[PDB]
Amino acid sequence: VHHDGFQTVKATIDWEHPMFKLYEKAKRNGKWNPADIDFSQDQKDFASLTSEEKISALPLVAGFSAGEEAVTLDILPMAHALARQGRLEDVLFLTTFMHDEAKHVEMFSRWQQAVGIGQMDLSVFHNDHYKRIFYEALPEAMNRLYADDSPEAVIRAATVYNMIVEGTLAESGYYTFRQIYKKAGLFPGLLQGIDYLNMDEGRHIQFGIYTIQRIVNEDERYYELFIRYMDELWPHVIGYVDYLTELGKRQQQLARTYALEIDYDLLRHYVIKQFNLRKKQISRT
Amino acid sequence: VHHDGFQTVKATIDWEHPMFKLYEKAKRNGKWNPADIDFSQDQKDFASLTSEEKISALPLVAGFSAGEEAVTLDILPMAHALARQGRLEDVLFLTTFMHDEAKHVEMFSRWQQAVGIGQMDLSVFHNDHYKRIFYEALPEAMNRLYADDSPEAVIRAATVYNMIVEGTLAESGYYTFRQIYKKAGLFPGLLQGIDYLNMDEGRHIQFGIYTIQRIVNEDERYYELFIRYMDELWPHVIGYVDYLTELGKRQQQLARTYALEIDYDLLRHYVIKQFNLRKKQISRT
Numbered sequence: 411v412h413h414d415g416f417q418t419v420k421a422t423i424d425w426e427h428p429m430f431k432l433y434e435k436a437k438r439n440g441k442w443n444p445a446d447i448d449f450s451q452d453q454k455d456f457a458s459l460t461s462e463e464k465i466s467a468l469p470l471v472a473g474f475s476a477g478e479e480a481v482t483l484d485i486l487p488m489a490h491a492l493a494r495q496g497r498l499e500d501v502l503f504l505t506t507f508m509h510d511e512a513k514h515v516e517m518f519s520r521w522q523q524a525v526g527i528g529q530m531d532l533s534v535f536h537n538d539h540y541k542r543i544f545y546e547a548l549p550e551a552m553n554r555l556y557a558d559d560s561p562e563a564v565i566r567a568a569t570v571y572n573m574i575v576e577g578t579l580a581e582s583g584y585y586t587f588r589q590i591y592k593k594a595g596l597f598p599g600l601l602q603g604i605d606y607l608n609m610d611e612g613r614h615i616q617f618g619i620y621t622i623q624r625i626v627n628e629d630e631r632y633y634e635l636f637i638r639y640m641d642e643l644w645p646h647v648i649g650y651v652d653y654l655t656e657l658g659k660r661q662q663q664l665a666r667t668y669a670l671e672i673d674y675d676l677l678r679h680y681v682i683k684q685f686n687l688r689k690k691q692i693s694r695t
Numbered sequence: 696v697h698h699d700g701f702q703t704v705k706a707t708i709d710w711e712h713p714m715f716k717l718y719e720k721a722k723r724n725g726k727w728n729p730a731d732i733d734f735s736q737d738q739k740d741f742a743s744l745t746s747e748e749k750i751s752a753l754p755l756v757a758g759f760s761a762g763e764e765a766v767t768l769d770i771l772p773m774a775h776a777l778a779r780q781g782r783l784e785d786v787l788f789l790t791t792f793m794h795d796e797a798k799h800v801e802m803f804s805r806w807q808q809a810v811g812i813g814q815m816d817l818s819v820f821h822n823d824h825y826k827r828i829f830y831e832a833l834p835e836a837m838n839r840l841y842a843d844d845s846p847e848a849v850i851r852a853a854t855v856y857n858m859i860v861e862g863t864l865a866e867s868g869y870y871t872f873r874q875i876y877k878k879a880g881l882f883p884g885l886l887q888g889i890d891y892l893n894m895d896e897g898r899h900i901q902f903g904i905y906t907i908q909r910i911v912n913e914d915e916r917y918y919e920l921f922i923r924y925m926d927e928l929w930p931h932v933i934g935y936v937d938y939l940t941e942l943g944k945r946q947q948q949l950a951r952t953y954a955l956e957i958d959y960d961l962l963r964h965y966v967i968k969q970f971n972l973r974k975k976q977i978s979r980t
């Protein structure tokens with residue numbers, strides 16, 4: 411359907427809009443290119459590993475590669491719905507958001523190629539709980555926005571994507587990668603990439619927070635909805651976390667070999683800490 | 696609806712795909728930031744002008760500011776349709792495409808602000824023919840892709856957006872800006888921006904060409920459709936061009952003052968040259 415006018419013809423960009431400022435920061439801090447990362451040492455490290463240690467690292471890479479690919483496809487409806495509501499600055503920022511995820515898909519896929527597992531199907535490490543979040547609830551909530559851009563729909567989409575998938579799982583994954591391999595001295599290329607992903611991620615979660623907080627602000631009954639959507643998802647969050655944990659407890663040889671005392675109980679409570687801390691970033695008032 | 700799998704989990708990115716290569720080029724050559732452009736001299740130039748010369752430049756800025764804003768909102772359905780067809784590399788590239796246009800909206804709006812016309816409504820320089828292309832046919836063709844991603848729909852969308860709006864009007868506009876103001880010594884900031892826009896634009900038109908050529912390749916009856924959609928639009932193309940030309944012939948004082956012999960007849964045949972040359976870039980075979 412038709413445009414009825416153009417903001418930057420009638421007026422200008424709202425330069426003071428937070429999403430315009432968050433767009434500006436993204437351009438300044440989003441210059442990194444996965445294609446400049448040197449994975450040659452990563453390749454050597456992965457070959458150096460035994461078959462059992464090789465396994466140790468794949469689940470996490472599995473969950474991330476599929477995750478980045480899901481959010482790259484699935485952020486589009488949000489940009490569409492906000493564009494329809496005339497939120498130009500939100501859209502400007504969202505272009506950086508979508509390119510960020512394209513680079514993230516790119517980064518993990520380069521790593522797989524480089525270390526020689528690109529031809530290996532890693533879908534096997536996606537369990538039921540993971541499929542429920544990523545194969546199902548995420549795309550349902552996002553695509554919903556094509557036909558229903560109510561406050562409710564928008565809140566639930568930001569919650570699933572920005573607060574749960576990014577704000578809870580992705581954050582915990584970044585932490586898990588560092589806890590394990592930055593210590594081991596392994597996969598310097600991957601960790602370079604993970605640090606850049608983690609930076610990008612800050613902007614993604616701030617968008618989620620702003621989006622949710624401005625809808626809560628108009629009517630604090632929506633706060634309750636927010637908490638409810640968080641808690642609806644927790645079981646699959648932890649159910650994936652437990653699954654990865656038990657895969658870990660059954661394949662200790664990467665831990666044995668690299669003198670790591672992998673405190674799965676500390677990863678567990680980091681996830682929890684993440685979940686509760688995302689809740690705290692939304693004010694009821 | 697659900698994801699049924701993920702390419703970068705089952706396999707990797709197709710690294711040899713042209714849209715993956717075009718994505719790579721975009722990252723290398725898309726670093727420019729409108730916010731680094733110095734418009735201080737532009738501000739002085741615009742104030743230096745008489746009221747009549749001030750007018751001379753606004754139509755063109757009008758058509759561009761609305762144009763950039765239209766394509767920023769209106770490229771989204773293309774990314775959506777290709778994402779649904781599983782064309783991952785196309786999507787990766789399209790993230791650069793969408794960010795490019797966000798920067799283009801940003802560039803012209805900064806210029807208006809800087810020279811002091813941000814508060815002026817420039818919609819008055821959009822005539823009937825322009826509204827038909829930009830207010831109507833462009834969004835119709837793009838949004839169509841949400842419910843109809845047939846070869847026909849896709850060809851017609853690439854034709855309206857990439858071959859006509861970018862490939863014919865935008866290209867001619869870049870040329871018109873240089874012909875007039877690069878000579879006059881005016882608006883160095885704006886022209887800096889225009890040069891960057893022109894570079895970005897090369898990738899946008901190549902995407903259009905690749906998209907159209909791969910559908911023609913499967914069935915050369917679609918070539919005819921391509922030419923037809925080009926010719927359907929020509930009247931509004933030229934009808935805008937004539938309108939801008941007559942606005943120009945009635946406000947000569949920028950020409951008189953800056954020793955410009957503005958060959959509107961040469962701009963005219965540059966537009967035509969553009970139109971015919973876009974046709975030539977699609978092979979029937």
Ligand SMILES: CCCCCCCCCCCCCCCC(=O)O
Binds near residue numbers: 586
């Ligand atoms: C053993 C402790 C478990 C740690 C939790 C790991 C969760 C893996 C992360 C996979 C999902 C990543 C989603 C990406 C989101 C984005 O890129 O914006």
Ligand SMILES: CCCCCCCCCCCCCCCC(=O)O
Binds near residue numbers: 796865
């Ligand atoms: C006097 C000679 C006329 C020259 C033709 C000028 C046409 C003005 C351009 C306005 C449309 C620009 C559309 C932008 C497309 C994009 O940014 O991808």
Ligand SMILES: [Fe+3]
Binds near residue numbers: 510514
């Ligand atoms: Fe990501």
Ligand SMILES: [Fe+3]
Binds near residue numbers: 511576
């Ligand atoms: Fe993210």
Ligand SMILES: [Fe+3]
Binds near residue numbers: 796
């Ligand atoms: Fe543009």
Ligand SMILES: [Fe+3]
Binds near residue numbers: 766796861895896899
């Ligand atoms: Fe363009």
